Amino acid sequence: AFINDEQEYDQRIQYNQFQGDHFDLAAISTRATGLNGHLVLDCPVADELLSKFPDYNPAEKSGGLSREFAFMRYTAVTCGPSNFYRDAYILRPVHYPIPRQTELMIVITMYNEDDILLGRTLKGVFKNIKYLESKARSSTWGKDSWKKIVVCIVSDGRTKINERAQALLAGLGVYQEGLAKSRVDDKKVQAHMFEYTTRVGISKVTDDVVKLTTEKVVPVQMLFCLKETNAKKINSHRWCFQAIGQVLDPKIVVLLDCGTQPSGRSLYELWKEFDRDHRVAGACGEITTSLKKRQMITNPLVYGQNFEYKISNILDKPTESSFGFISVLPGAFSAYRFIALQNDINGVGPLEKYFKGEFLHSSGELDPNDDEFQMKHLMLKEEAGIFTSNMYLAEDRILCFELVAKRGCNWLLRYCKSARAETDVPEGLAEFILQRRRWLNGSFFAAIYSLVHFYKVWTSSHSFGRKIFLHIEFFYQLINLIVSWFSIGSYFLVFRILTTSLGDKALGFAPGKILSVIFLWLYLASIVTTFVLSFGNKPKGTEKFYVTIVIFFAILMAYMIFAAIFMAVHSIQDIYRSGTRITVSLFFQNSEFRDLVVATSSTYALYFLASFLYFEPWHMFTSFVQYILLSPSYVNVLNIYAFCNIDDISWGTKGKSLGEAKLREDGTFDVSVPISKEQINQSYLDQLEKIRDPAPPEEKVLVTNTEDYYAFIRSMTVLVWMFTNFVVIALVLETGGFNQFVEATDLANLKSNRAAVFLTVILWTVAFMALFRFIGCIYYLITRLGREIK
Amino acid sequence: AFINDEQEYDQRIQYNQFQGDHFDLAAISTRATGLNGHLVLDCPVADELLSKFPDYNPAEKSGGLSREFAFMRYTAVTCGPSNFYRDAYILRPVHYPIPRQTELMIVITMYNEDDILLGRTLKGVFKNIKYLESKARSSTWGKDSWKKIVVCIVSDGRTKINERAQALLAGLGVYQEGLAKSRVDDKKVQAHMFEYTTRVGISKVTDDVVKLTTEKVVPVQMLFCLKETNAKKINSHRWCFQAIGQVLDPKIVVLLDCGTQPSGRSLYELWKEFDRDHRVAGACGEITTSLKKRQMITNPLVYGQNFEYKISNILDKPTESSFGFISVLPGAFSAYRFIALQNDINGVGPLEKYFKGEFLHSSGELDPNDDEFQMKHLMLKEEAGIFTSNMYLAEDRILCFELVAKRGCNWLLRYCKSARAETDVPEGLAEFILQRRRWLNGSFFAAIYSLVHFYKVWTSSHSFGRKIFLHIEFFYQLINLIVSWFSIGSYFLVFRILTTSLGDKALGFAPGKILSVIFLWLYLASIVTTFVLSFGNKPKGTEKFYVTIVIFFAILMAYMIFAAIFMAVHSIQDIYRSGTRITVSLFFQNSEFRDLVVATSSTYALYFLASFLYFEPWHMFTSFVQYILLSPSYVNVLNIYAFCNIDDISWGTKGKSLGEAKLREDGTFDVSVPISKEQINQSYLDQLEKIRDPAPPEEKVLVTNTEDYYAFIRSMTVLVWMFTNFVVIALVLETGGFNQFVEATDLANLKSNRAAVFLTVILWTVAFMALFRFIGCIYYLITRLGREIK
C-alpha cells in the first residue's frame, strides 16, 4: 500500500516543523464522556499510521506526535442541517484554545464513486495545498497555511457509499468502522462526522490501484461527513452551507465533485480572483475532458463532448464574465464568497431560494419525529407559485441570478481561464442522456426565470452603464432562448428544404426524390420512437434504439451537408453560365450561394480564430467532425428526453395484528374469543346500528399528492412545445391546411420563397450570435491582459 | 334494522320444516380444540338472531335450533389455494355424518364495495334460491334444495373491505369480529373463512339503507372467505376454483360480482341450459343497465353504454352461441361446468393457463417463508414465450378458447337470453376509461391468441361440420380484428375525405374550407393531447381534458353526418339535372349516393329489425343518438388509453443498526468502541488489504426486473400500431412523400379516386359484417324456438 512543478514545491517547504496544536480530548474508558452533551469520541489511530510519520519516536508512547495527529475525533449529529449551529456542536478547528479562522473550505461531494476518482480528487487538492504552503512572498499564504484550509467530504448515503472509497478514507486515517453508532438517547443519528489531520499523501493514482505514502506530505485537515440516508446533492449542499459553514464561518467556499482533478495552482488562481476584486462573489474554472486512452474513431462521443466543452470555455464563459453575469457556474468546479450567499434579516436570500427546491419537490409525508418538522411543515404550508414550486429544475443556476440582482448589494460573477480542472465524461450513451436531461432542464428554467424577473436588477446598487450592459446581455439571452426553443422545428425545416431542393429537375441528380422520401419516413419514425421511449422506458434498457437513431441522424447530417454543397456548386455554375462577366456583387446577390456558404464559412472562421487566439487549436481538428455529426442528435434526442422527463419522481407511491394463537403441549390451541352472551349481543347490536344509517357524503377535499402536479406541469410544457413548433413548421412549408388556400401552381413558388426566407433568417441569426460571442471573448482577453499588466 | 312473482314462491314453500342436520362442534372453554390440527372455532351466534327465528322457543337454551343454525364456524387458512386440499381443511358441508353433494356454487367477488351493491346481489341470490325451493315438479330441485347450494363470498383485502358491507355480513350472522386471528403456530393466516347457515333475508334495498327481515326466509349456506392481503381477482378466482371447488367438488360454478342483481329465475335458466345438453361447458346471461333515476339528456354516457350492451346481447352473443364458440363470457354473470375446467394428467389445462398469468405478471420477489415458494419458483424458472408471459391480458377470455379447442373433448359455449342480470355502469368518464382499458386489451389479446392457435381445434373430437363452421367463425373474427386494428386511421380518413369534399367549389358551401382546416387542427391537437395524457397522467386527475375531447369529437361527428347528407343531396340533384329520365339503376350507379346512403341505411335497418324481433325496441330510440355521437370517442380515446397502458405495473420498485448509545445517570454516554491496540492495527491492515487490490469485473448478468419487459412490449405494440395506421393513411390520401411522385393536376384526381374506393370499401365491409351478425341472430332465434318446442 505504501511506496517537475511538484518538485519545486517540496524545495521551499521545510517539512521539519509540523507540530500540531494541543486540544482537549474526550475520556474513553466502555463509558465515554461527550462534549456539550453530544456523543463525541477521541479514539487513537492505528499505531502503524503514527509510525510512518518521520517525527515518530519508538521510545515515545505516541511517538511524540501532537494531540491532533494522534487522535481521531468522531461526532454523531442528530439534529440536522437547520439546527446544527443552534445546538452545541463544536468542530475541532474552532475548539482549539486559540481559535483558527478558515480561509478556504474545499467541499467534495461523493456518491458511490470508485476509489480512483476520490484518489484523483484528493491528489489534486493535496498538490494545491502543498503549492500554497510552498509560496514564500505571500501575505496570506506560506508557513502554517494548512491551518487555514479545511477539506470537507460529504458522502451521500451510508449504505450506498462504495467500499473501496471507504477503505481509501480509512487508509487516510479519517474513518474507523467501530465508532459509528446508529442511535443516541433514542434519537436517530442523521450524519456521522470524522475529523482528523491526516499526514498521508497519495503518491500516484494508476488506472486500477491507488498508492499512498507519507514522504513529503503536508498535513491536511479532513472532515468526513457520512449521511445516514441519501437526500440528494441539494441536501449535501445544505449540510455544507447551512450547518458546517456557519460554525466554521469560512470565505471562498470551493465546490468539487469526485473525479474532478484540479491543477497544481488552480485553487490559488481562484483565491486570487476573489482577492483582487472585492465585488466578485462567484468564480469558475475551465473544465477539460481526459483523452489519454481514448481513440479518435473508437469513441466519437468523448471527442464530441471535448469539442463542446472547449467551445463553451472559449466563447460562452468569457462573454458572460465580461458582462458580469454568468448563467451557470459548473458545480463540478466553482467557488463562492460565503458572505455574499447569506440571507437578509427578513429571511429572503439566495440560499433560501436554492434550498426551497429540496423541500417543495418531495413527497408530502413528514415524519412527526423529525426535529425539522416545524420548518418543513411551515414551508410546505406556505402558498407557492409556479416559479417557487419549480425551483428544483434550476439547482445551483438560481444562485447566480440571485447574487447578481440583489436588493442593495454590488456583486459580480467572473470566469478565470488560469484555473483548470480535468474530469471524466460519460462514455456510454445512456449515461450521457441521463446527464444531459438535468442540464437542459436547468438551463431552460434558469433562462426563463431570469428573463421574467429582469426588473429586479433595477434596485441593485450597480453603475448605470453596468445596468445597461446587463440589459444587453438579457436581450442576448432572450434571443438565445427563442432560438433554442425552436431547435427541433428549425432542424426539420432545414432538412426538408435541402432534401427537396435536390428533387428539382433543374439539377441533374436522379435519386434525389426517392432519397428524400425515404429520409422523411425515417426521420418521422425516429422522432416518434424517441418520444415513445422517452415517455415509457428507461435509457439503460433500450440503449440500442438510441444508438441506431443517433447513427441515422449522423448519416442524415452528412447527406444534408452534401446537398448544400451540391446546391451551392450548381448555383455558381449557373452564375457562370448566365454570362455578362462576374462580380463579387453578383456572388453576394445569389441567395442560394450566399445563405448556404458565406454564413457557415463565417461561423467556422470565427470559431477557428477564437480557438487560435486562446492557444487551443487542436480541438478544431481532432474533435470537430464528431460534434458536427452529433449535433442533430443533441437537438433531437437529448431535448426530447429532457422535456418528456421534466418531472423527476424519485419517491414512490404512498408509503394492528388481530391476535396470535400458539399451540400448547396438548392439541388444544390457545385463543382469546368472546364467550359471554352480553358482549356478543352488544357487538351484534353495534353492527346493526352501524349499518342502519345512511351513507354520509365523503367531501374529503384532500390536498392530494405532489407527483400529479409535476406530471401535469411536464405534460403542459411538452404540449405547448409541440404546438409552437408545429405552428412554425406549418407556416413555413404550408404543411397543414394552409395548402388549401392556394392553387396548384402558386403553392410551389410560395413554398420556395418562404423556405428561402427561413433559411437565410436562421443561418444569419446563428452567424450573428457567433459574432457577438467572438467580440465578447476578444474583449475578455484584452481586459484580462490589461489587468495582468496592472 | 328489522322490519308478485316472489309471492308465488312463498305459497309453495311450507316454511314450517327447516330443521338442520346435526354436526360435531369444537370445544371452546380460553383454550379451544381445533379439528385436524387446524384453528377451528364453533362460536355461538347472538341471541337476538336466534330469537328472530319462528322456531325459537324461550324455554329452550338455544331455542331448539339445530347445531348448524345455532353456531357459526370460523377457520384460519395458512397454506393458500395450492395446498388447501392437500391439508386437512374440511368445510362444514362435507363434514356432516351424511355427506352433502353440492349442485350449484354461487361465487361472489367483493372489493371495497358499498353495502348497497352487496345487498342487491344477496337479495337476487336469495330470491333465486327461494324460487328453486318452491319448484314442485322437478326431479333435482324442490324440498330441501337449499342443501345443494352454497354461496361463497371472496372479499379481496382485509384492510380494504368496506365497513358497511362487513356490517351487513355480520347482520347476516356470518361474520364476527373477535374470532379473527393474525397468526397461528408462527404461520401467517392467508385467509379467514366464516361458515354459517343464515336464515336472514333482505326484504328490500333502498338507495341509502338496507332492510333485512326473518319473515319467509329460506335458509342459505354462506361461506365468507376474507383474504388477508389483496392479490387481485385472479387470486380470488384461484381461491374459488383451485381450493374450495376441489373440497366441495360442485357442478355449474356460477360467478357473480357485487352490484349485479340476477332475476328471479335466472339461475334456474342457467342450470337448465347446462342440464339439457351435456356438451355445454360454459354459459352467460343477458346483462342490462339500470336507468331508474337517470335522465336521457343529463347522462348521455349511461344511455350510450345501454345501447352498446343491448346491441351486443342482440347481435354478437347469439351468433357466437350459434357457432358454438363465444369470445368472452361476462365475468359479472356467467357459469362454468366444473369437470370441463379440470386439467389433464400431464398438468396442462384451461385452469393452468388462466392461473399462470397471475404468477408470471408480478414482481420477481418471492418470500422464502411462503409455503407456495416451490410452485412459484418452478413456474418462474420455466421458459415462457410471448403468449404465456402475456396471458394476464386475456383473463377469463382464455378459458373459452381452451375449453372449445380441447385435445380430445367435445365442449361448447352457449348463451341464453332467458337469464337476465342488472348491473351498475360507471357514470364518470374516468371510471369508464379505466374499465374499458382492460376490456380492449383482453379482447385484442384473446383474438390474436385464438387466431394464431386455430389449428388446435383439429385434434378436438368435434363433428366435421362443426369444425368447418368454427373455421368460418375464425375467419369472421380475423376480419373483425383487422377492421378494429385500423379503426383510428379509418375514422381519420373518413373525416378528412368528408370535410374536404365540402371544400369543392362545385357545391355551394362557403365556410367549407375554413371549417375543414379548423377541424383538422383541432383533431390533431386532440390526438396528441390524448397520447400525452395517456402516457403521463392519470384519468382521475385530468378528467376535464378528456371531457373536452369527447365533446369536440361529438360535434365533429355531427358535422361529418351533415356533410355526408349534403353530399348525397347534391349528388341526387345533379342526377336530376343531368336529365334523360331517372332509373333505379342510375341511382345505384352513383358512387356518392350509393356509398354514403345505401350502406348506412341498410346497417340501420338491420339493427332496427334485430331489435324488433327480440321485443326490445326502445333502445333504438332512447339511446341511439348518444351512442352515435360517442362512437368516435370510443374509437379514439379509449383505444389510445388502452394501448398506451398495456402494461399494468401495480407493484413498486425494489422493496443492521451499528449501535445504540444510551445516556446513563451521569453525563457519560455508554458506548462500545475498540480499545485494544491489536484490534485497531488489525482493522487498519484489513482496510489496507481491501484497497490494495485491483477492481474485478462485475459481470453480474442479472435477470433484472419484469416491469422493463412489459414496458418494452407495450412500447413495441404502440409503435407498430402507429406505423401501420400511418402507412394506410399515406397510401389513401397521398399524405407523406408520395405526393412528390405525381404532378400538380394528377394528384387531385388520384386522391379523389383513392378516397372514393376507401369509402366504399369501409362502408360495405361494415354493412356486410352487420348482415352476417343479423343472419346469425336469426338462426339463433329459430333454433332456440325449435328447441323450446321440443
Ligand SMILES: C[C@@H]([C@H](N)C(=O)N[C@H](C(=O)O)[C@H]1O[C@@H](n2ccc(=O)[nH]c2=O)[C@H](O)[C@@H]1O)[C@H](O)c1ccc(O)cn1
Ligand atoms: C456532472 C459532473 C460530474 N461528472 C458529476 O457526476 N457530478 C454529480 C452531479 O452533478 O450530481 C455529482 O453528484 C454527486 N451525487 C450523485 C447522485 C446523488 O444521488 N447524490 C450526489 O451527491 C455524484 O457523486 C457526483 O460527485 C461533471 O464533471 C460536470 C459538471 C458540470 C459541468 O459543467 C461539466 N462537467
Ligand SMILES: C[C@@H]([C@H](N)C(=O)N[C@H](C(=O)O)[C@H]1O[C@@H](n2ccc(=O)[nH]c2=O)[C@H](O)[C@@H]1O)[C@H](O)c1ccc(O)cn1
Ligand atoms: C365490470 C363489471 C362490474 N361492474 C365490476 O366492477 N367487476 C369487477 C372486475 O371486473 O374486476 C369486479 O372485481 C372485483 N375486484 C376489483 C378490484 C380488485 O382489486 N379485486 C377484485 O376482486 C370488484 O369488486 C368487482 O366485483 C361489470 O358489471 C361488467 C362486466 C362485464 C361485462 O360484460 C359487463 N359489465
